[PDB]
Amino acid sequence: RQMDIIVSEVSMIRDIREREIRIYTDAGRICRPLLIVEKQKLLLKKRHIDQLKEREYNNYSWQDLVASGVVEYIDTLEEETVMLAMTPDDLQEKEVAYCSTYTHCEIHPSMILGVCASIIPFPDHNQSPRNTYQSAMGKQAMGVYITNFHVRMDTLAHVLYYPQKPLVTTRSMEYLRFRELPAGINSIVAIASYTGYNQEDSVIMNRSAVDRGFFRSVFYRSYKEQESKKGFDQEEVFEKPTRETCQGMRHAIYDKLDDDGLIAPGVRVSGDDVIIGKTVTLPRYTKRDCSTFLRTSETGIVDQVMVTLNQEGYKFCKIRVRSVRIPQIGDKFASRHGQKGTCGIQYRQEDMPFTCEGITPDIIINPHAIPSRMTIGHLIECLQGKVSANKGEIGDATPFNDAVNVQKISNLLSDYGYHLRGNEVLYNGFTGRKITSQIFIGPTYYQRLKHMVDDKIHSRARGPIQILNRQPMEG
Amino acid sequence: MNAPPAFESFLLFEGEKKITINKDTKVPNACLFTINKEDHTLGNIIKSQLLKDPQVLFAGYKVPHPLEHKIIIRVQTTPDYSPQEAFTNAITDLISELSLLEERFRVAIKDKQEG
Amino acid sequence: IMLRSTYCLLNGLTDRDLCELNECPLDPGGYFIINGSEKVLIAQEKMAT
Amino acid sequence: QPMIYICGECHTENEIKSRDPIRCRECGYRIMYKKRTKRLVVFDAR
Amino acid sequence: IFTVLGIEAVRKALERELYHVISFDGSYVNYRHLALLCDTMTCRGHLMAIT
Amino acid sequence: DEITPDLWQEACWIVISSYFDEKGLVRQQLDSFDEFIQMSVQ
Amino acid sequence: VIFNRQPTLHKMSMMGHRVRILPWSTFRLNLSVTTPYNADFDGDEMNLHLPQSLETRAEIQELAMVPRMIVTPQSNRPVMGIVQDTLTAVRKFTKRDVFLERGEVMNLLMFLSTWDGKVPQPAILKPRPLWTGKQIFSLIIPGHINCIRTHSTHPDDEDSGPYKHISPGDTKVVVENGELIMGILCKKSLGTSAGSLVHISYLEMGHDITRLFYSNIQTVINNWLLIEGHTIGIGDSIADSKTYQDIQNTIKKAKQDVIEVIEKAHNNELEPTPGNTLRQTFENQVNRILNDARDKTGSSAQKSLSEYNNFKSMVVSGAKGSKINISQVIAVVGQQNVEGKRIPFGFKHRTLPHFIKDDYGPESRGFVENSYLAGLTPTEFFFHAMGGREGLIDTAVKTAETGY
Amino acid sequence: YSLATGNWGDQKKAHQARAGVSQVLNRLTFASTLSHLRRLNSPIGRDGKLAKPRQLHNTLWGMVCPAETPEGHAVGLVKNLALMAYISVGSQPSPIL
Amino acid sequence: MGKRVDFSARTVITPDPNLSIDQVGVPRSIAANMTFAEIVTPFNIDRLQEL
Amino acid sequence: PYANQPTVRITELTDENVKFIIENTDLAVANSIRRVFIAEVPIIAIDWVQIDANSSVLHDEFIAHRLGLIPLTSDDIVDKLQYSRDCTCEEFCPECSVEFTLDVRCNEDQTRHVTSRDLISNSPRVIPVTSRNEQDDILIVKLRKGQELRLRAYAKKGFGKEHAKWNPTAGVAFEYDPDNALRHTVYPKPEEWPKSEYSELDEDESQAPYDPNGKPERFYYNVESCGSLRPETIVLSALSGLKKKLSDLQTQLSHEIQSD
Amino acid sequence: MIIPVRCFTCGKIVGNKWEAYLGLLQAEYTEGDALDALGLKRYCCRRMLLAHVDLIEKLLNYAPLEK
RNA sequence: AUCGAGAGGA
Ligand SMILES: [Mg+2]
Ligand SMILES: [Zn+2]
Ligand SMILES: [Zn+2]
Ligand SMILES: [Zn+2]
C-alpha cells in the first residue's frame, strides 16, 4: 500500500486454516480496484475527493490514490480472504451487525458490468437473458463507429445520419464515450396494439419520421484491386477495356470508367456495374477482361477512389461506394433491453395515433413483448425519458441507485401535466376517435441494427452451379 | 429495391379508374364502391355522412390492405332509394358542409385579425 | 506494433496531433495493423501454473 | 485524358499518366485520391 | 425387463417409459406414434437401439 | 474528514472518473504489449 | 409455394401458401401461421420454394396447404390458433359489457368475408341500439358448430352451486348453432388445445371454412382493437401500498423462518428425514420455506390486480405471460438456482466476498427478495445472471443432442 | 502470418495451431470495438457440451461482465472484462524475496 | 439426402394481419426473379403471348 | 339526410399557430380535416438537387435530404404553381418549380455556417422561412477552411402524403370531449389524470357525468405551422383540398353511374 | 452528426435552434430553461435538442481533401 | 475459384 518494493499488482493471499501464504507476481491475474477499510471506516476521506475534483490542475490522479494506501488491487484469489462492503452503508453500525470486520469496499457495484452491459439503463429491472441479448445487440447497433470514418476504406461500414445520446443514461457511459459516439436515437415509443402489424416482436414505424431522417444511415462498401506484374508471362493493368481486344467482357457497359480504368467519385453505380477496368495480358486477343464489378444489387454512389502502391509496389486501388439506407419494412431495430423486432409497416403521421397535443409515436411496439420477457427496464426507461425530455435533463439509470425508483419518477412526471405512470389518451389516426385504453408512450432509446432486409433478400431461378457436383451455388 | 414510389398511394395508374361500382348480390339494394388511390381520409367521411341518411341501411368502408391504395365502401339503402344516389347525396352534403365551414373560418379569421 | 502503445508513433500525441494525422482521438488503440487489416489479440484463458 | 489526382498529404493538384508509379511531386506521398466527377448526378431531396 | 420378462413385456414397458418421458411436462403425443416407435424397436425379437 | 452518504454517490463516481482518466478501457492490451517489448523480447 | 422455416421439426414447418404480391422486400405471413413455424418477427428469415410442374403444384395444393394443416396428427389438436393481439382482444371483446354502436358494428362487418349481408338484430334495442361482442363473434363463428369450454378464470366451485347455466363471471363458454351464447373466449376456446372452437370448426366444417374462420377472427378483432386498444406500462407493474406491505411482511416471515431453521441446524436441534442426509433436509426445509414465501407473495400480487391491468389482460387471454411473471414483476423474483440447487459456494464457503463464511441464509444463497420493478441489488443481480446463464447454456446445449 | 490468420503457432503446423486468437477488429460501432478489445476467451472447445466451464462462476464478480456473452454456441466461453478489471502484467519477485 | 435447389427464395418475415392463413406476401423482386414454366394452349395462348 | 351546419370559433391566431374550435360537425369530418392538415395541404419544398461541388464532411444525399426539409414560403405561390406531372414543359419551368442556388466556400480559419440564408432563389416570393424578414437560419452544414459547397436545387409542389417535407404543420393538436362525457376513454383511476386545457370541471370532479345520448361535437384544434404557410392558410387550404377531392370523386362517380 | 432540420415526430424546425441553444447554455441557463426559451414545448422537440451530439464539430478537426 | 478460419443471424 506504500508502493514500496511490492508493486500494486502483487497478490498476497493468507490461507489461515491451512498455513500457507501464497504471493503471486506473475502476469495474467485478473484483479480489480477496491477501497480499503479501516476498523469500520473507509480510508478514502474528503481530502482525497477534494484533490480528485481538481484533477486537471494539481495533477492528483488515480495513481496517487493508489499510492496513498486508500485503494488496492485485489485479484480473484485474494478476494477469498477479503470481506467486502457493497457500499459504505454496510460499514454503518446496525441494530444487528452482519460483519463488523470489513476489509474493503466496492467503489461502485455497477462496475461489475462490462462495456456493452454498461449501456443498459436499469439493467437490474430486466430479466438477465434480456441484458445478455442487449449486450450482444449493442455491437450490431449503428452509430458513428469512429470519428475519422471519412478516411477509412473499410470493407463494410454503417454510419447513422443523426445519432443521439440517450435521454436516459448510466454513469458508466461517460467513460465508454457513448455520449461522444452514440449508436441510436431517442424515439417516441408507444407500447400499443395498433393495426396488428407489430405482433410477435415487430414494430410499426412512423413513415413521416423516417422521411425526416429518423434512423437513416449511410452504408460504405470498399472494393480493393491491384494490378499484378508477377511475370512477363501475364500482367494485369487498370485501363478502360474495349470490345475489340478483351475476351471475357461482360455485356455491362464500361462507360463510367475513366482512361485509367477507375470510376470517378460522384458517379451513380447500379448492380453489376464496373468500377475498376482491369485487363490481363493473354499468353479478344492479347488481353482478357478481369474487371471488378459491384456486389450485385447494391445501387450506391462512388464515395471516393484512392490510388497508391502496395508493399511490393504495383498499383493498388481502393474504391468506396456509398449507399443511403432508409429504414423500411424488415429492418431490425432494438431497444437497450433485448427488445428486438423488425419493422412490420410504416404509417404516415396522419395514420399514426396521436395525443391531445399532436405527438405521434416514432415507433409502436406490441405490449405482448413485455410480459414474458419481463423487461421492466424498458418501461422505467420510457418513463424516466419522458421526465428527462420534459425537464431538460439526462436521466440517471445507473443500475443500483436507491435515489431513483419508479415512484419518484412518477411523482416527477405528474409535475409536468402528464399521467404519473406514463400513460396518455391517444386518438385513432384513421378515425380520430379516442382509444378506450390509455396508451403508454414516451421517449426510449432505440438502435438500428446492421441487419437490413435488403442485405438478406435473395432469390434464385436457374443460376450458376458448383463445378464438382452440378448443384446450385452457396450464398 | 422494393420501395414503391410515394406518389403511387395518391396518383392513378393509366387505365385504372378512380371509382368502380359493383352490385352486392348478398342482399338487395347494396353496392360496393371500390375507390382507388384514396384512404381513410375520404372513406371515413363518406361512411359517416352515409350513416346520417335514414334511407341508408348499411354504410361501411375498409382499406383491404394498408400497403395497397384503395378503399371499399359498402352501401345498402332502402328499396325506394339507391346506393349510388345515397353515395352522391353524401358527397354533395360533405361538399356543402366543407364550403360552409370554409366560409365561416374565413369570417372567423377576418374577425380575429381585426377584432 | 500495437497502436497507442509506447513504441507507436501515436504515443503521447494530443487530440490535435491525432486529428492532424487523420486519427480519431477517441480510438482506444490496442490492436495491430497487419496488411492494412486491424487485428485484435483476444486474451486466452489458461489454467494457472 | 490527364486524370489529375490529389495528394493525401499535401492536397496538391497533380497529373499522372498510366504506367507511372503513384507519387506526389510536392512531397512524394504514396496515396492519391481521384477528383469528383464532372457528370451530373441528381438527388431527390428525400 | 427384456432379459427377465421378454420382448412383449419390454415393448409394453418401453411404451410406458417413453410415455412417462413425454407426458412429464404435461405434454401429450398420440399413442400411435409411441406404438410405432416401440414396434420398430422390438419387431425383430430383440431390443433394437435407435443407433 | 469522512465522506458522508449524501456526498458518497459523487465521491465514488469522482474516484471512478479518475481511474478512467488514468487507465482507459484498453489498458490491459497496451500494458501487455509494453511489457513484452521492454522485457519479454530481451 | 412451399414456405419453410428452419429447423424443420415437423410436417407443419413446410406448408403450402398462395402467393400475394406486395410492395416491400419481406415475406409477409399471417399471424396464426407463426406458431406452426415457430416463427416470430425478430429477424427470422424463411424459405420459399416454387413447385415447377402441374404435378407438384397439385400435390402441394391437395396435401400441404395450410388449411389442410390446421390439425396435427401428433396430438390430434390444432397446430395453429389465435395468437397475441387477436387473443387479448377477443378476450376483451367477448366480455359481457362490450356494447357496439351501429357504425362500429358496420365497420366490423366490413371485415367479415363470410357475411351474408344481414345486420343482426341488436341485443339491446332501447334506449339505444347496441350490439354485443358475442353477437358479432357469433357472425364470425362458422356453420352451426356446438362447443362448451370454460374461460381460464372460471371458478372451480361454480359448476356445483347455482348459476351453472347463468355464469356470474361470464365464464363457461357456450357456442350453440354457431352463435356464442355466452362466455369469454380465450386460449382455451381459440388456442391450439383439443376441443376448442377452431378444432371443432375443422372437424365439423371443412378446412376452407376453418381458414375463413381464422382470417375473419383476426380481421374483425384487430379492427375492433383499433377502437379498444391494448397497452402495457409502469402502471400495470405497480401494486397498492397495502399489497406491497403484505408482500414485505411475507418475505420477512420467510427470512425469519429461515433463520429459525438455521439456528436449529446450528444447535443440532434438527434431525434428518428418511431418505435424505442432514444437509439435504436443511436444504429442503429452507427451499420449501422460500417457495411458500414466493407463492404467497405471488398470490398477494395477483389478488391486488384490477381488471384494468394489462398484465392480467394478457395472462387471462393466454396471449402471453403467466402468473409467475406477474409475481416476479410485482412481488418478488425469488430463488435463483444453479443446477437445481441454491447458488453454490464458489468462493471459500461463500457465494460472494460480500457475505460471511457459512451463510446459508436466503440472501446469501440467491433469493431475490425484490421484484423487477423494485430492482435487484448487486448480489441479487449477479445471482440472477447466474440463473439466466444456466437457462442460456441449456438452450444452447440441448439443441445438438435433441437434433441428433 | 500468425497475427494475420489467427492460427497461433508455426505456419507449417497449421492444424496443431489454435485459431481464434488475433481476430479482425470489429469496427461496426464504437461499443463493438471496445468490447472486442476487452474480449476474453476460454479455449475449452465449442464442441464440448459440459455446462460447467460455461456457467457464470461466482468468482467472475467484478472481473468479468455477468451479462455480455454470445448466446450461440460459445455461451459463457467468450467473456468480457468488467469495467474496472485490470489484468496484471507481471513483475519480478526478487524485491519481495 | 439434402442439396441446393433452384427456384428458391429467402428473406426476412414480417407480420401481415390482412393475409389469410394460407397466403404468403411476396415481393415483386422475388416474384420477378422466380418463374413458372406454363405450357401453351389455345386456353392460354393470348395471356401467355402478352406475358 | 343532409349536411352539417358547422360553426367555427378561433380562440388564438398568431404567425406560429392557430387555435380554433369547430362545433356541430361529425368526428369523421373533424378527423379528415386534421388528416388533410398533415397530408393533403400542398406547399413548396426542394425536391431536386444537383451538387456541383461538395467538400463538406456530409455526403451529397445528406445535404440533399437536409435541403428538402427546409421550409419555403408557399403562401400565394403554391396555388399558382402546377405539379410537374401536370406541367406541359420539360423537366422544369417557372410554372411548376422554383430555382435555388447555393454557393459557399469557407476561406477564413473559422467555421463557416452554411445556413438557409445561403439558399438564393430566383422567385422572391418562395424563399426559406427563416430568411424571410429573432429566429436564426436553419443550418445546412458547417464548413472548415478549404471546404466548399456549390449546388443547384429545384423546389416543387407536393403534400405530406408523398413526403413529410411537404407537410406544412409542426404539430396538429386535436381534441374532443375534454371531460370524458362520452366515455370514449375509460380511465381505470380517473382521479389520476390531469385535466385538459379545455376542461370545464371543478377540481374535485375528475370527469364529466356519462352522457348516453351524446356524440362528439366541438372539436378543438391547434394547428402549428412549420413556416411555409400561415396556419389559417393551412386550414383554408385543407378545407379547399378536402372539398375539392370530394368534387373530383363526385365527377368520377357521375361518369361511372352514367356509363352503366 | 449535425442538428436535424425538423423534429422527427412533429416536424417542427429545430435546425435553427442548436446555435441559440448552446448560446443559452453558456449564458448559465439550465437545459430545460433554455429549451423553454427556444419555444420547444413538446417533449419530442426537447428530445431533439437535449439529446443531440454535435459530431460535425469533431469531423471538422480533420483537414479537407483539397486545400 | 477452392480451402480453411473467424465473426454473426434465427
Ligand atoms: Mg425469431
Ligand atoms: Zn503531396
Ligand atoms: Zn413546368
Ligand atoms: Zn417535435
Q: Do J155 and J235 fall into the same domain?
A: no
For J125-163, b where at least 16 C-beta lie within 10 A, e where not — what string? Answer: ebbbbbbeeeebbbbbbbbbbebbbebebbbbbbbbbbb
Please tell me if residue E33 touches chain G, with a CB cutoff of 8 Å.
Answer: yes
**Pick from J69, A267, J136, A187: nearest CA to K12:** J69
**Pick from D1, D14, D6: nearest CA to D35:** D6
Contact flag, residue G43 CB and nucleic strand L, below 7 A: yes
Contact flag, residue H70 CB and nucleic strand L, below 7 A: yes
CA distances from J29 to A255, B43, B91, J225, J243 (A): 56, 10, 12, 21, 11
Residues of I in contact with A327 (CB under 8 A): none
Please tell me if residue A16 touches chain F, with a CB cutoff of 8 Å.
Answer: no
Please tell me if residue K66 touches chain D, with a CB cutoff of 8 Å.
Answer: yes
Residues 118-147 of A with CB under 7 A from strand L: 136-137, 139-140
Catalytic residue status for A201: yes
Interface test with A, best of G49, G329, G354, G364 (most A CBs within 10 A): G354
Q: What CATH number is attached to the domain comprising J192?
A: 3.30.1360.10
E strand residue ranges, A138-213: 156-160, 168-169, 185-191, 202-206
The minimum CA-CA distance between K67 and chain J, rounded to whole Å, is: 5
Measure, in angstroms, how far nucleotide L1 C1' is from residue A153 CA: 25
Q: What is the residue-wise DSSP string for G295-313?
A: HHHHHHHHHH--TT-HHHH
Interface test with I, best of G18, G27, G220 (most I CBs within 10 A): G27
Domain ranges, residue J185: 1-42+165-260
Interface test with B, best of I11, I12, I14, I18 (most B CBs within 10 A): I18
Residue J88 CA to ligand 3 center (angstroms) comes to: 6
Residues of J in contact with G306 (CB under 8 A): 188
Please, which residues have CB less than 5 A from ligand 4, an ion?
A: K 7, 9-10, 12, 42, 44-45
Q: Please check if J106 is assigned to a binding site.
A: no
C-beta of residue G151 within 8 angstroms of C-beta of residue G170: yes
One-letter identity of residue J212: P
Exposed, middle or buried: residue B82 (CB in 10 Å: 0-12, 13-18, 19+)? middle
H and C in touch (3+ CB pairs within 8 angstroms): yes
Residues of B in contact with J247 (CB under 8 A): 95
State the Cα–Cα distance between residues G366 and A340, nearest whole angstrom: 29
Cα separation of the two ends of chain B: 56
Could you say which of J121, J149, J164 is where a domain stops?
J164
Domain ranges, residue B109: 1-115
State the Cα–Cα distance between residues G315 and G323, nearest whole angstrom: 7
Q: Which of H38, H89, H90 sits opposite F25 (nearest CB)?
A: H38
- Please give the grid coordinates belonging to residue J173: 393538436
Angle in degrees, CA G262, G266, G269, rounded to 5 = 90
Measure, in angstroms, how far nucleotide L4 C1' is from residue C45 CA: 24
Angle between helices G133-140 and G207-228 (to 10 degrees): 150
Angle in degrees, CA G96, G101, G103, rounded to 5 = 145
Domain ranges, residue K56: 1-67
Q: Do J67 and J123 fall into the same domain?
A: yes
Q: Do J83 and J119 fall into the same domain?
A: yes
State the Cα–Cα distance between residues K6 and J226, nearest whole angstrom: 9
- Which chains form contacts with chain G, at 3 or more CB pairs under 8 Å? A, B, E, H, I, J
Please tell me if residue A237 touches chain H, with a CB cutoff of 8 Å.
Answer: no
Contact flag, residue H37 CB and nucleic strand L, below 7 A: no
Provide the 8-state DSSP code for G350. Answer: B
State the Cα–Cα distance between residues J253 and J259, nearest whole angstrom: 10
Greatest Cα pair distance, chain G, in angstroms, is 83
C-beta of residue J170 within 8 angstroms of C-beta of residue J224: yes
Q: Cα-atom radius of gyration of chain F, to the nearest Å?
A: 17
List the nucleotides on chain L closer than 7 A to a protein CB.
Answer: 1-2, 4-10
C-beta of residue G79 within 8 angstroms of C-beta of residue G70: yes
Exposed, middle or buried: residue J185 (CB in 10 Å: 0-12, 13-18, 19+)? buried
Grid cell 436515437 is found at A185
Q: Which of H37, H89, H90 sits opposite F26 (nearest CB)?
A: H37
- Please give the grid coordinates belonging to residue H94: 526478487
CA distances from G24 to B7, B10, G34, J164 (A): 15, 18, 20, 20
Q: Between chains, do K63 and D11 touch, taking CB under 8 Å as contact?
A: yes
Measure, in angstroms, how far nucleotide L4 C1' is from residue H5 CA: 10
State the Cα–Cα distance between residues A210 and G280, nearest whole angstrom: 60
Q: What CATH number is attached to the domain comprising K8?
A: 1.10.10.60
Q: Please check if G240 is assigned to a binding site.
A: no
Nucleotide with C1' nearest the G39 CA: L10
Pair type for strands G71-72 and G77-78: antiparallel
Contact flag, residue A451 CB and nucleic strand L, below 7 A: yes
Residue J232 CA to ligand 4 center (angstroms) comes to: 20
State the Cα–Cα distance between residues K8 and G198, nearest whole angstrom: 44
Percent helix, strand, coil in chain F (nearest 5)? 75, 0, 20
Q: Do J240 and J250 fall into the same domain?
A: yes
Residue A306 CA to ligand 2 center (angstroms) comes to: 14
Q: Which of A124, A154, A201, A272 is catalytic?
A: A201
Please tell me if residue H23 touches chain A, with a CB cutoff of 8 Å.
Answer: no
C-beta of residue G83 within 8 angstroms of C-beta of residue G35: yes
Tally A–F CB contacts below 8 A.
Answer: 70
Question: Coil, strand or helix: which one is G54?
Answer: helix
State the Cα–Cα distance between residues A86 and A74, nearest whole angstrom: 15
The minimum CA-CA distance between C27 and chain A, rounded to whole Å, is: 7
One-letter identity of residue E50: I
Domain total of chain J: 2
Please tell me if residue A98 touches chain G, with a CB cutoff of 8 Å.
Answer: yes
HSE at residue D33, side-chain half, CA atoms within 13 A, is 23
Measure, in angstroms, how far nucleotide L6 C1' is from residue G84 CA: 39
Cα separation of the two ends of chain H: 40
State the Cα–Cα distance between residues C12 and K25, nearest whole angstrom: 33
- Please give the grid coordinates belonging to residue J2: 343532409
Q: Which ligand is nearest to the CA of J99?
A: 3
C-beta of residue A320 within 8 angstroms of C-beta of residue A302: yes
State the Cα–Cα distance between residues J111 and J146, nearest whole angstrom: 10
Q: What CATH number is attached to the domain comprising B82?
A: 3.30.1360.10
**Closest-approach residue (CA) in chain H for F28:** H87
Please, which residues have CB less than 5 A from ligand 3, an ion?
A: J 87, 89, 93, 95-96
CA distances from J223 to A458, G29, J89, J238, K67 (A): 45, 39, 36, 11, 48
Domain total of chain B: 1
Q: What CATH number is attached to the domain comprising J114?
A: 2.170.120.12
HSE at residue B7, side-chain half, CA atoms within 13 A, is 9
Contact flag, residue H9 CB and nucleic strand L, below 7 A: no
Please tell me if residue I9 touches chain G, with a CB cutoff of 8 Å.
Answer: yes
State the Cα–Cα distance between residues A448 and A214, nearest whole angstrom: 10
E strand residue ranges, B11-112: 19-23, 30-36, 56-62, 70-77
Resolution stated for this PDB structure, in Å = 3.1
Q: What are residue H64's DSSP bridge partners? A: H81
**Closest-approach residue (CA) in chain G for E51:** G404
Q: What are residue A434's DSSP bridge partners? A: A427
Q: Do J131 and J22 fall into the same domain?
A: no
Residue G51 CA to ligand 1 center (angstroms) comes to: 26
Contact flag, residue G392 CB and nucleic strand L, below 7 A: no
Residue A330 CA to ligand 1 center (angstroms) comes to: 13
Could you say which of J138, J164, J190 is where a domain stops?
J164
Question: Coil, strand or helix: which one is A308?
Answer: strand
**Closest-approach residue (CA) in chain J for A303:** J59
Domains of chain D: residue spans and CATH: 3-46 (2.20.28.30)
Phi, psi of A187, rounded to the nearest 5 degrees: -115, 140
Tally J–K CB contacts below 8 A.
Answer: 79
Grid cell 450506391 is found at A300
Nucleotide L10: nearest residue by CA–C1'? G44
Could you say which of J131, J146, J164 is where a domain stops?
J164
Contact flag, residue G44 CB and nucleic strand L, below 7 A: yes
State the Cα–Cα distance between residues J226 and A206, nearest whole angstrom: 18
Measure, in angstroms, how far nucleotide L4 C1' is from residue H1 CA: 14
**Pick from H59, G173, K1: nearest CA to A218:** K1
Exposed, middle or buried: residue A398 (CB in 10 Å: 0-12, 13-18, 19+)? buried
The minimum CA-CA distance between C2 and chain F, rounded to whole Å, is: 7
Phi, psi of J199, rounded to the nearest 5 degrees: -70, 145
Cα separation of the two ends of chain I: 37
